[PDB]
Symmetry: C3
Subunit: 488 residues, 3 copies
C-alpha cells in the first residue's frame, strides 16, 4: 500500500501577506499588531493617575473654586484632563513657562500641599479676607483662588512684604505666586497706594524682578487688568525671599515634592478603573506583550511602537490548501500536529502527526516569533509633548521626529514580516521536503515515488513498515526480494 | 536530438551589486534612486508658489519699495527667494520672532492685503506723508515701506494713538507694526516731542509693552537709530488695540489669512515654469514614484527619502552571461521572455520562451519590486528648517536628527537592495532549477542529462516531443522501447 | 577505500546566536561590538584636546585665579572638564546663554588671548587696581578675574565709558563682559556714585540695554550682590561699542577665534596621553573599524553607533561539532582551510583542504562581513548635548531622539546579525552540499553513497583517484569494468 507525506490543513481563513504573493491563507498565525484596547484609564506602574476632571492643571495648582479634591494619589504616574477642561486660570493672563510646570508635575513620587505661609497672622497689617473677585465665582458671591492669597492694602498704607522661608523639610519645595497688572492707574492707586509698585524674588539659583504694565485691554471674562503666574523650585537647604512694595498674589500653600523621570499628560473622557496597567493611550489602556500597536500614536509607559499598518501577521502554520501528498495539498483528516504520515497496514488508515519532527519545528518556530518580540528593547517614555503659540519651529521639529520614526517603523515592520513570512512559508516546504528525503534514506530504490509527493511500497507489510520508518531501520535487501516481481 | 534549458541573455551592461559579489551584470534592473531632476521651480499641489524675486520675506511683508508685485498666487504651496535676496529690512534692526513669521507664512490657503487702517484720515492730528528716509530710496528721493506708516508729530504735539480694530472678517488676521529707537535724545525730542515714549499693544491672547533704547550705534546703511518689527495674530471675533504716546510705525495694511499645515522656504535662482509637481528640491522639481533620492536633502511635499548612495539598483532580470545549457550561460538567440527551451524536430531549431513560467515569475517579481515602493508611507513634510544666531543647540539637534535618518536610510537601503538582490539572483536560479526538475518529472530515466544543464533524448521524435513537455504528458514506457538500444 | 567530505572543526568555544537556534558554537567569528576601550583621553583628529582640570569653562574664559594654563593647544578638538570642576563663576550669578557659549567654544581652529583693551591707561580717570573681592581669593588677599576688569569710581566721580574697538584682525572676535548688581542702594552709591546706572552695548548684528536690580538676596559664597556675564561675536570689519554710566565689568582681554563645525564637551577624570584618535567616549578613547559599540552612549568624532546589546557576533566559520562525513560531524584532523577531502590510496590517510573552493568561499564571506561595516556611513558628530534648568521639554525631546536611535539600532542590529547568521550557517551547508554534488557530477553511478555523507569507491585506485576528483576528469566507462563485480 501507499505511504503519503504532507501536512495538516485547517478550516480557518487566517491570511498573511508575503512579498512574493498577496492575500494567501495560512493555518495558524501570530498577530503582532494590537487593534483592540481596554477602553479605560487605569492604574499604572503600581499607582493611580491624577484625574483632574472638569479642571486643568492651571486651575488645580491654583486650586480653582470649581475644582476640589484630594490628590488622586499621594503618588501618581500621569495627569489626566477630561476632554472638556474649560476651567483654569479663571482670572485671565499668561501662566509663564506653563508648559514647563506641566512637565515637572506630570509624575511625582510624593506630594503634600502644606501651608508654608499660613493664613493665620503671617500677614499682619495687610488684608487677606477681601481679595476676591467675580471672575471665579462661587455661591454667586465674590471668591478667589484657594492656594494663593491676593493681598490688598489695609487702611491707607501698604507695608512692604519681607517674607522668607528656609527649606528645612528635606525635599524639593515647589513654590508659586502671582503678580497683578491693574488696568488703570486709578485701580492701582486705590488697591496698592503706590504707583512705583514692584516685586523682587530672591533665591540662590534664581532671582528676578517684576513690574506692573498698567494699560487698558480687551475684556475677557469681563476682566480688564490681568494676572501673571510664576513659579520656582527651591532646593534642599536653599532659601526663598519675597519682597514687594506693591502688586502681589503671595503664596499661602507651597507644595512638598519629589520627582522621578516622569511621563506626561493625557486628555480624554474615558472613565477611571482599578485594573493595573503598563502601557497607556488616550483612548484606553493596553495590556500586551507585542512590539507594535496602531490604536493611537500618543502613549505613556513601556510603549509598543506605533505603526500605520493594519495586518502585521506572522505565519506559524503552513500554506492552507485543502484542495495524495503535499504536492496536491494537505489533510484536514489530521489533527494536533503539523507534518505527518498517512500509512496503511492490515488495520491501516492511520493518519498521524510525526511528533519528533513537529516538536523540532515548533521549537524553532516559537523561538522565531519570540525573537521578533523579546529583542524589542522597549523603555519608559512619554511620546506626546506640548508647545505653545510661538514655538512652532520646535513643534514641527517634534513632528518631523514623530513621523520619521513612524515612517521608519512601518517600512521596517511591513518589510520585516514580509521577509520572515517569505522565509517561514518556504521553511515549512523545506522541512517537509527534507523529511521526504529522510524517508528516501531508507527508500532509496525500494519504492515507487509518484509526482503527488507519495510512495507506493513494492511489497506487502504490516505496521512493522511504519515501525521501520519511525525508527529508520529498514534491512533493505530482504525486502527487495518480495518487491522483486513488482519492480520487474 | 537535444532539449536544452536556460535563460535569455542580453546585450545590455546594467550592473547591480550583491552582498556576495560586487559589480555583477544583470539583464534588466529597476533603478530606485533618482539622479536626475527637471531643473525648474514648479506648480505644486494644484497651486503656484510665491516667488519673491530680488526681495526677501522681511521686505515683501513690509512691502519694500524695491519689490512690487501681486501675490504670485492667491494660494501658494511654498515661498521661494532667489539666491541673491539682498533687499529686505532696509531700515536696520531685528525682526522679532522673524523665523516664526517665516514659518507661518510658508503656505496659505488664502491671503489678501487689506487696508484695515486706511491712509485716508485714520490719523487726524498726525503726519502720515513725510515719514520717509534715504535708507530705502526711490527716484533718489526719500521713501519708506508701503505696508507700514511711520507716524510723526504734526505741528508741536503728539496726541496719543488709541486705534482699535475688531476682527469682523471671519478669518485669522495677521497684523504687524514697527517701533523706532532714535539714536539720540535730540532726535527723539524733535520727532516725537516726548522722552517718556512707550507703546502698548492689547489683545486677549497677548499683551506686551515696548520702550525706546536711545543710544548711539555703529552705522549700517548709514542709519544710526534702529527699528524693531513685531507681529500678531488676532483670532476671529478678537480685538486688537494700539496705544502709543510716542514711537510707532503703525500698521496701515493688515492681512487676511488662513493657514493649512504648510511647508517651508526654498532659496535658489531656478526659473518658474507651469508644469504640475508633487515633490520639490532647491535645485529642481521631481516627478517620481520611487522611494529614494539623492539630489538634495532639502525637500518639500511628498518627499522621497534622501540617501548618500549612488547605485540602488534592484535586479529584475537574470545574471547576464553570453559566454548548451544554463550552466554554460544564457542565450542571446532568445527574445521576449526569460526562461525557455531550445528544441529540435524535423523542422527544429526552435528557441522559445516558456510563457506560463515566465509570466508566473514576472507576476511575483513585479509584486516584489513594487512592494519596496508601495509600502514606503511617504507623507507631507518640509525637511529644511531655520535657526538664528543664538539657537545653535537646537540647530545642531536638528542636524543630529537629519543625519540620523540619513545614516539609517543609507544603511537600511544599501543593505536592503543587497539582501533582495542576493535573494532574486538565486531566485532565478532556483526557478530555473525547479523548471528543470519539472522536466525530470517526465524524464525520470528516459533521457541522458549532461553537465551543461541539458538533455539528450534517447530516441527520435517530431515536435510532439515538445508537445509532450509543454503539456507534461509523456506516456513513458512506450518511448523506452525506441530508447532501448541507445540506453543499452 | 573511501572518499569523505566535510569540514574543519576546531577547539574553540566561540558562540553565535541564530534566530532558529540559540547559543550555538561556530569555529570562527567576527565580533562587531567593542566591549573594550583604551582608558585614556587622547589626541584626536591631529590635535590635542583642551583639558581644563580643576576649573570649568565659566572659570577658564573668565580666567579664575585658581585656573592658570596656556590653551592646551592653539588648536583643539574638544573640551574636557574633570569630574571635579567646582571652580567656576566664583562670584555668583547666571552666565547668560552659558550653554550656548559652551557650544561655540567646543572646538576652535585657532584661539589667541589678546589684550584688546590693555590694562595700561586704556582706563584713565577710573580704577582698575582695586576691583577685587574675597569671593575668589589668593594668598588670603582679595583677588579677581584676570580676563575681566571690574572698574570702580576714582575719587568721587564716574566718567561715562565710551570704549570702542574695530575688528581689524581679520577674524571672528569673541568679546565678553560682566554687569554688577549691588545688593543695596548703599553699596551702589558708594561704588558707582550713581543711582541711574545703566549699560549699553552696540554692534551691527546686535544691540541691547542692561540695568541693575538692587535687592537683597540669600548668601552664596557669602556674596549678596551678584554678577551677570554676557558675550558677543563681532564679525570682521564690524565695530563694537560700550557705554556705561555705571555698573560695568569691562573686558581687558578679548579673544581671536575661528570655528569649524565642532564637537562638544566631555566630563571625566581619565588622564591625557599622546596617542592619536578618531573616536571618543567619556571613559576612554577607542580605535576601531567596527559599526557598533556599547561602552558609552556619549561620543565625539566618527562615532560607532551605540547599542544596548552584548554579543553581536557574525559567523565566518562553520557549525562547530567534533562529535565519516559532514552528516556525522567535522574533522579536527584538518587544518588551514574549511571544506575538504579525506581520501585513501596506497600511501593514503590524506586530510587536505580544497583550496580553490575554500578560497572561493572566503572571498565572498570576507566581502559579506565587510559589507556590513564599509556601508555604515559614519560621520562627525557630538551626541551629548546640554540643557539648563528650564529647557526640560527640549531636554526630553533630545532624550526621545537618543533612545529612538538606540531602540532602532538594537532592533536593527540584533535582527540583522540573526538573519545573516541564519544565512551564513546554512550558506556553509549549501556550499558543502554543492561540493558533494560537484563530486556526483563524476560519481553519478560508480560509487556507493552512505548516509554519513561519504563515498565508498567500487574499485581500487592510487592517488590518481584524487587526481580525477581534484581535476574533475574521470573517464567513467573505462573504469567501470573494475567496479563491475562490486556493483554486482
Ligand atoms: C495591582 O497592583 C497592586 C499594587 O499596586 C497589587 O497589590 C499587590 O498586593 C499584594 C497583597 O495583596 C502584595 O503582596 C504582599 O505585599 C505585602 C506588602 O504590601 C507583603 O508584606 C506580602 O509579603 C506580599 O508580598 C503585592 O506586592 C502587591 N503588588 C505589587 C506589585 O506590589 C494588586 O494585587 C494588583 N491587582 C491586580 C488585579 O493585578
Ligand atoms: C495642472 O493642474 C491644474 C490644476 O491646478 C490642472 O487643471 C485641470 O484642468 C481641467 C480642465 O482642463 C480640470 O477639469 C475640469 O475642471 C472643472 C472645474 O475647473 C470641472 O467642472 C470639470 O468637471 C473638470 O474636472 C481639472 O479638474 C483640473 N485639475 C484639477 C486637479 O482640478 C491642469 O490641467 C494640470 N496640467 C497639467 C499639464 O498637468
Ligand atoms: C600622530 O599624529 C601626528 C600629527 O598630529 C603625527 O605626526 C606625523 O609626523 C611625521 C613626522 O615624520 C609627519 O611626516 C612629515 O611631515 C612633514 C610636515 O610636518 C612633511 O613635510 C613630510 O613630508 C612628512 O609628511 C607626518 O606628516 C605627521 N602626521 C600628519 C598626519 O601630518 C604622528 O606621527 C602621529 N603619531 C602616531 C603614534 O600615530
Ligand atoms: C468654569 O468656571 C466658569 C466661571 O468661572 C464658567 O464659565 C461660565 O459658564 C457659563 C455656563 O456654565 C457661561 O454661560 C458663562 O458665560 C461663563 N462665564 C463667563 C464669565 O463667561 C464655566 O462654566 C466653568 N467651566 C466648567 C467646565 O464647568
Ligand atoms: C537693496 O536696496 C539697497 C538700498 O536700499 C541697495 O543697496 C545699494 O547697493 C549698491 C550696489 O547695487 C551699493 O553700491 C550701495 O552702496 C547700496 N546702498 C546702501 C545704502 O548700502 C541694493 O542694491 C538693493 N538690492 C538689490 C538686490 O537690488
Ligand atoms: C574653588 O575656589 C573656592 C573658593 O574660591 C574653593 O571653595 C572653598 O573650598 C573649601 C574646601 O576646599 C571650603 O571649605 C570653603 O568654604 C570654600 N569657600 C567658599 C567661599 O565657599 C574651592 O575649594 C575651589 N575648588 C577647587 C576644586 O579647588
Ligand atoms: C473549525 O475551526 C474552529 C476554530 O478553531 C474550531 O472551533 C471548529 O471546531 C472547527 N470546525 C470544524 C468542523 O473543523
Ligand atoms: C483577499 O481575499 C479577500 C476575501 O476573499 C478578497 O475580498 C480580496 O479581494 C482579496 N484580495 C485581493 C488583493 O484581491
Ligand atoms: C527683612 O528680613 C530680614 C531677615 O533677616 C531682616 O534682617 C531685615 O531687617 C528685614 N527688613 C529689611 C528692610 O530688610
Ligand atoms: C521506536 O520508536 C520510538 C519513538 O521514536 C522509540 O521510543 C523506540 O525506542 C524505538 N524503538 C526501537 C527498537 O528503535
Ligand atoms: C541591444 O540593446 C539595445 C537596448 O536594449 C537595443 O535597442 C538593440 O537593438 C540591441 N542590439 C543588438 C544588436 O542586440
Ligand atoms: C566594475 O567594472 C567597471 C567596468 O570595467 C569598472 O569601471 C569598475 O571599476 C568595476 N568595479 C569593481 C568593484 O571592480
Ligand atoms: C480710547 O478708545 C476707547 C474705545 O472704546 C474709548 O472709550 C476711550 O475713551 C478712548 N480714549 C482713552 C484715553 O482711552
Ligand atoms: C497543450 O498546451 C497548451 C498550452 O499550455 C494548452 O492550451 C493545450 O490545451 C494543451 N493541450 C491539451 C490537449 O490540453
Ligand atoms: C586550540 O586553539 C587555540 C586558539 O586557536 C590554539 O592556540 C591552540 O593551539 C589550539 N590547541 C589545540 C590542542 O588544538
Ligand atoms: C549557553 O551555554 C552556556 C555554557 O557555555 C550555558 O550556561 C547557557 O545556559 C547556555 N545558554 C542557554 C540559553 O541555555
Ligand atoms: C564717544 O566716542 C565717539 C567715537 O569715538 C566720539 O565721536 C564721541 O564724541 C564720544 N563721546 C560721546 C559723548 O559720544
Ligand atoms: C590538476 O589540478 C591542478 C590544481 O588545480 C592544476 O594546476 C592542473 O593544471 C590540473 N591538471 C591538468 C592536467 O590540467
Amino acid at each position: 500500500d501507499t505511504l503519503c507525506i504532507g501536512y495538516h490543513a485547517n478550516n480557518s481563513t487566517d491570511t498573511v501577506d508575503t512579498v512574493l504573493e498577496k492575500n494567501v491563507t495560512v493555518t495558524h498565525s501570530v498577530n503582532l499588531l494590537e487593534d483592540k484596547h481596554n477602553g479605560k484609564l487605569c492604574k499604572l506602574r503600581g499607582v493611580a493617575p491624577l484625574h483632574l476632571g472638569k479642571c486643568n492643571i492651571a486651575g488645580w495648582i491654583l486650586g480653582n473654586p470649581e475644582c476640589e479634591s484630594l490628590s488622586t494619589a499621594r503618588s501618581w504616574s500621569y495627569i489626566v484632563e477630561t476632554s472638556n477642561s474649560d476651567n483654569g486660570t479663571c482670572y485671565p493672563g499668561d501662566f509663564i513657562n506653563y508648559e514647563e510646570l506641566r512637565e515637572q508635575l506630570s509624575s511625582v513620587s510624593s506630594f503634600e500641599r502644606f501651608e508654608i505661609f499660613p493664613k493665620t497672622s503671617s500677614w499682619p497689617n495687610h488684608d487677606s479676607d477681601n481679595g476676591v473677585t467675580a471672575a471665579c465665582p462661587h455661591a454667586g458671591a465674590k471668591s478667589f483662588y484657594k492656594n494663593l492669597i491676593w493681598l490688598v492694602k489695609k487702611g491707607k498704607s501698604y507695608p512692604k512684604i519681607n517674607q522668607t522661608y528656609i527649606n528645612d523639610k528635606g525635599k524639593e519645595v515647589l513654590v508659586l505666586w502671582g503678580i497683578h497688572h491693574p488696568p488703570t492707574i486709578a485701580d492701582q492707586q486705590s488697591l496698592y497706594q503706590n504707583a512705583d509698585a514692584y516685586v523682587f524674588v530672591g533665591t540662590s539659583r534664581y532671582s528676578k524682578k517684576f513690574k506692573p504694565e498698567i494699560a487698558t485691554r480687551p475684556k475677557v471674562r469681563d476682566r480688564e487688568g490681568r494676572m501673571n503666574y510664576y513659579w520656582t523650585l527651591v532646593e534642599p537647604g536653599d532659601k526663598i525671599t519675597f519682597e514687594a512694595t506693591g502688586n502681589l498674589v503671595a503664596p499661602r500653600y507651597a507644595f512638598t515634592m519629589e520627582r522621578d523621570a516622569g511621563s506626561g499628560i493625557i486628555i480624554s473622557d474615558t472613565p477611571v478603573h482599578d485594573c493595573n496597567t503598563t502601557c497607556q493611550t488616550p483612548e484606553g489602556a493596553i495590556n500586551t506583550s507585542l512590539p507594535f500597536q496602531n490604536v493611537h500614536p500618543i502613549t505613556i509607559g513601556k510603549c509598543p511602537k506605533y505603526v500605520k499598518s493594519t495586518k502585521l501577521r506572522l505565519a506559524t502554520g503552513l500554506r492552507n490548501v485543502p484542495s495524495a501528498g503535499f504536492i496536491e495539498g494537505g489533510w484536514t483528516g489530521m489533527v494536533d500536529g503539523w507534518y505527518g504520515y498517512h500509512h496503511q497496514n492490515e488495520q491501516g488508515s492511520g493518519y498521524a502527526a510525526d511528533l519528533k519532527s513537529t516538536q523540532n519545528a515548533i521549537d524553532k518556530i516559537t523561538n522565531k516569533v519570540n525573537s521578533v518580540i523579546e529583542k524589542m528593547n522597549t523603555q519608559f517614555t512619554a511620546v506626546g509633548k506640548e508647545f505653545n503659540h510661538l514655538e512652532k519651529r520646535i513643534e514641527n521639529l517634534n513632528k518631523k521626529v514623530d513621523d520619521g520614526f513612524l515612517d521608519i517603523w512601518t517600512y521596517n515592520a511591513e518589510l520585516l514580516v514580509l521577509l520572515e513570512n517569505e522565509r517561514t512559508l518556504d521553511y515549512h516546504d523545506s522541512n517537509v521536503k527534507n523529511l521526504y528525503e529522510k524517508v528516501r534514506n531508507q527508500l532509496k530504490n525500494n519504492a515507487k515515488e509518484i509526482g503527488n509527493g507519495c510512495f507506493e511500497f513494492y511489497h506487502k507489510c504490516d505496521n512493522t513498515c511504519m515501525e521501520s520508518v519511525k525508527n529508520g531501520t529498514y534491512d533493505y535487501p530482504k525486502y527487495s526480494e518480495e518487491a522483486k516481481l513488482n519492480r520487474e
